[PDB]
Amino acid sequence: KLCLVCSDEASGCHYGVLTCGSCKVFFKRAVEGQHNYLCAGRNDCIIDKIRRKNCPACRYRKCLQAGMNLEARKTKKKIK
Ligand SMILES: [Zn+2]
Ligand SMILES: [Zn+2]
């Protein structure tokens, strides 16, 4: 039911894991601009619906932690 990064209701399977549409596009836009996200804190920001925008670094590390990857979407559009 819930996005694995930010805990809002999931929308589907994107880049291998169950996510909302918002984290789908964050991650898409992150790997396309290869952004230098750094965390001003101690890498322990809460990532939830209200706070996810506060620290793209910490939200980025969560997608990785939850196992998103560009490898999944490439292969899934080739299988199709
Ligand atoms: Zn999310
Ligand atoms: Zn942070």
Author numbering: 419 to 498
Please share text taken word for word from the publication where this structure appeared.
The GR DBD crystallized in its free form in space group P1 with eight molecules in the asymmetric unit. The eight molecules contain four dimers that are linked by a disulfide bridge via Cys431. While this dimer appears to be advantageous for crystallization (no reducing agents were present during crystallization) it is not likely to form under physiological conditions in the intracellular reducing environment. Within each dimer, one molecule shows clear density within the C-terminal helix (H3) following the core DBD, whereas this stretch is mostly disordered in the other molecule. In the free state observed here, H3 is rotated by approximately 60 degrees so that it would lie across the minor groove of a bound DNA. However, the current structure suggests that the orientation of H3 relative to the core DBD is not fixed in the absence of DNA and adopts its active conformation only upon GR binding to a recognition sequence. The core DBD (residues 421–491) of the individual molecules within the unit cell are very similar in structure (average pairwise RMSD = 0.49 Å). The largest differences are located within the lever arm region and are similar in extent to the variations observed in GR DBD bound to different GBSs. In the free crystal structure, His453 is flipped out in all molecules. However, close inspection of electron density shows evidence for an alternative, packed conformation in four molecules. These observations suggest that the lever arm, including His453, is mobile in the free state and samples multiple conformations resembling the various structures in the presence of different DNA sequences.
